[PDB]
Amino acid sequence: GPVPSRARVYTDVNTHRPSEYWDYESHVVEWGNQDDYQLVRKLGRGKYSEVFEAINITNNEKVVVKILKPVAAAKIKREIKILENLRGGPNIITLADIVKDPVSRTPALVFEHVNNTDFKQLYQTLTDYDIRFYMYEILKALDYCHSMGIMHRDVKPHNVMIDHEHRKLRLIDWGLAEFYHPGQEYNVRVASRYFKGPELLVDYQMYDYSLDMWSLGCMLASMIFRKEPFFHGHDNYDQLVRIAKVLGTEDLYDYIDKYNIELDPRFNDILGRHSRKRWERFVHSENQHLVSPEALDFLDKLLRYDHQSRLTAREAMEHPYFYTVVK
Numbered sequence: 001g002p003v004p005s006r007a008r009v010y011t012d013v014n015t016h017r018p019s020e021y022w023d024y025e026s027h028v029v030e031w032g033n034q035d036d037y038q039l040v041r042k043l044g045r046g047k048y049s050e051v052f053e054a055i056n057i058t059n060n061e062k063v064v065v066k067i068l069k070p071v072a073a074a075k076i077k078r079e080i081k082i083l084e085n086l087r088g089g090p091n092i093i094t095l096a097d098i099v100k101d102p103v104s105r106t107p108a109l110v111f112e113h114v115n116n117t118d119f120k121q122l123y124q125t126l127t128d129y130d131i132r133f134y135m136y137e138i139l140k141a142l143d144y145c146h147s148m149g150i151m152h153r154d155v156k157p158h159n160v161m162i163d164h165e166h167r168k169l170r171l172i173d174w175g176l177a178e179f180y181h182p183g184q185e186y187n188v189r190v191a192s193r194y195f196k197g198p199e200l201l202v203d204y205q206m207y208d209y210s211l212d213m214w215s216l217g218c219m220l221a222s223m224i225f226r227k228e229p230f231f232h233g234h235d236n237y238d239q240l241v242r243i244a245k246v247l248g249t250e251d252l253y254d255y256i257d258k259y260n261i262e263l264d265p266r267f268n269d270i271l272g273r274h275s276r277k278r279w280e281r282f283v284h285s286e287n288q289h290l291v292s293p294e295a296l297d298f299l300d301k302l303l304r305y306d307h308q309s310r311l312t313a314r315e316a317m318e319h320p321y322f323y324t325v326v327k
């Protein structure tokens with residue numbers, strides 16, 4: 001069957017820690033007071049929660065309340081533990097409280113206020129400098145959570161909250177996040193279609209932090225090339241074909257050969273034969289001011305089929321693309 005894989009960094013972070021850290025099922029939730037929070041307006045509803053702008057009446061501060069749907073139980077406890085472990089980390093959303101919602105009778109997570117604007121609202125109109133600046137800020141969040149033994153697994157523009165006026169960023173929605181344990185097989189039904197890594201699309205379960213680096217590369221490609229999304233699949237199958245039209249089929253078959261993966265036979269009639277395209281193929285008069293040799297070299301090193309070959313978050317922070325960013 002498939003050949004096993006291990007992360008090349010932060011491999012054994014969870015193995016050395018006491019079970020209290022990663023055994024989210026044994027965690028005891030310290031319940032706050034639901035009356036401290038007054039709901040103001042509904043911001044949105046996703047698959048697993050409803051999100052509201054609210055006010056913390058004990059200090060008049062604005063907060064965000066995420067009321068969980070009563071679907072999964074193990075999933076709820078995992079999100080709370082991950083948020084508590086990461087609290088105070090660079091550009092990580094701050095969990096302020098956990099209360100029991102009086103109506104839904106489910107946990108409600110209370111977060112520090114952020115502007116009601118996601119990165120998808122701004123990321124197609126940034127300058128070259130601001131793409132570099134904000135990507136460096138996202139990398140600080142990813143290296144921190146990876147160093148803490150956690151993969152986000154849902155990196156996408158909607159999950160990056162930005163306050164452009166204040167040049168501040170937060171990585172949000174840790175509901176799909178998981179503790180990395182070497183040799184563990186994970187569910188491939190994570191991330192949004194356009195940001196899914198080839199490991200998810202070929203059903204390779206022993207993936208790691210590097211999945212977040214492919215999703216980050218998809219975001220960068222969409223920003224520097226002004227193409228939303230960069231890989232525009234009609235479904236999870238066509239998503240891999242769209243990737244193969246850019247990266248080529250030869251490196252795809254080498255990746256599948258290396259990990260001894262059984263590619264779904266559905267692909268035999270749709271994948272075709274494609275050579276790797278040079279990154280200059282995507283450059284045009286409308287995006288050329290966002291492209292540089294450094295941007296293309298950095299993107300090339302994130303968008304690799306082999307998850308073990310992608311830059312790690314710390315390696316990404318060292319790249320020449322960020323030499324222009326004031327630190």
Ligand SMILES: Cc1ccc(O)c(C(=O)O)c1
Binds near residue numbers: 051066111161172174
């Ligand atoms: C601050 C904020 C806003 C919306 C959200 O959905 C989240 C979250 O899921 O963590 C956080």
